[PDB]
């Protein structure tokens, strides 16, 4: 399967889901043997960048997180495993951003990932992007709080089954066809 392996998005799958939602042909990032590949031009241009962390010679799969650009010289790190996990990548990622930039980790809660990091990056990651860049942005705390709550509410009522079933259904191609703001909307509008 090109887009999904087990219940995780491959790099091809991540590109494909952003293309299907209407974000065009995006550039993703990675951390290979502890060294980041981050195109800052594409980051600034996109407003965000999914980053496949934890990869290396013997590891194609890793842990997806989302790099977000805010207003000004502010950047954010969304980690579906929670605040501590993200703080794990904070430094190495921060040193890749423009001089004068700051990188803060979104303080969302642990225990809600369920092996769905790619899905979360493509949904909650985008919603965090949109929230932090709207006219009256919430505080970092409110954004973290809100993301935690949204992940928990989506996992309720057979959420894991619904998400994993959809991901398996779209393992090779996505259905048509309206564009969407985030992956949850795409899922709900293409079978869930």
Identify whether 182 is a catalytic site residue: no
Query: CA–CA separation, 119 vs 47, rounded Å?
Result: 18
Find the catalytic residue in 15, 25, 39, 79: 79
Find the catalytic residue in 15, 25, 60, 63: 63
Identify whether 79 is a catalytic site residue: yes
Identify whether 117 is a catalytic site residue: yes
Cα pseudo-dihedral 17, 154, 146, 5, rounded to 10: -40
Helices assigned H by DSSP within the chain: 11-21, 40-46, 83-94, 117-120, 126-132, 140-155, 159-169, 183-191
Query: CA–CA separation, 100 vs 125, rounded Å?
Result: 24
CA dist 45 to 23, 36, 92, 139, Å?
11, 18, 21, 23
- Sign (positive/negative) of CA torsion 129, 130, 131, 137? positive
Find the catalytic residue in 15, 60, 117, 157: 117
Query: CA–CA separation, 100 vs 102, rounded Å?
Result: 7
Active site residues: 63, 79, 117
């Amino acid at each position: 399967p090109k887009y999904v392996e087990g219940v995780e998005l491959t790099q091809e799958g991540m590109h494909a889901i952003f293309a299907r939602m209407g974000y065009g042909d995006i550039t993703s990032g990675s951390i290979y043997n502890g060294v980041p590949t981050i195109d800052t031009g594409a980051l600034n241009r996109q407003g965000f960048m999914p980053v496949l962390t934890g990869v290396g010679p013997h590891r194609d799969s890793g842990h997806w997180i989302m790099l977000i650009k805010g207003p000004g010289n502010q950047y954010y790190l969304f980690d579906p495993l929670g605040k501590t996990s993200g703080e794990g990548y904070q430094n190495i990622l921060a040193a890749q951003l423009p001089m004068g930039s700051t990188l803060s980790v979104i303080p969302n809660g642990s225990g809600l990932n369920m092996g769905l990091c790619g899905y979360w990056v493509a949904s909650a990651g985008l919603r965090a992007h949109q929230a932090l860049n709207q006219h009256n942005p919430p505080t970092l705390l409110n954004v973290g709080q809100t993301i935690t709550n949204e992940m928990r509410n989506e996992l309720d009522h057979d959420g894991y089954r619904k998400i994993t079933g959809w991901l398996r259904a779209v393992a090779d191609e996505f259905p048509e066809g309206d564009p969407q703001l985030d992956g949850k909307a795409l899922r709900e509008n293409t079978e869930k």
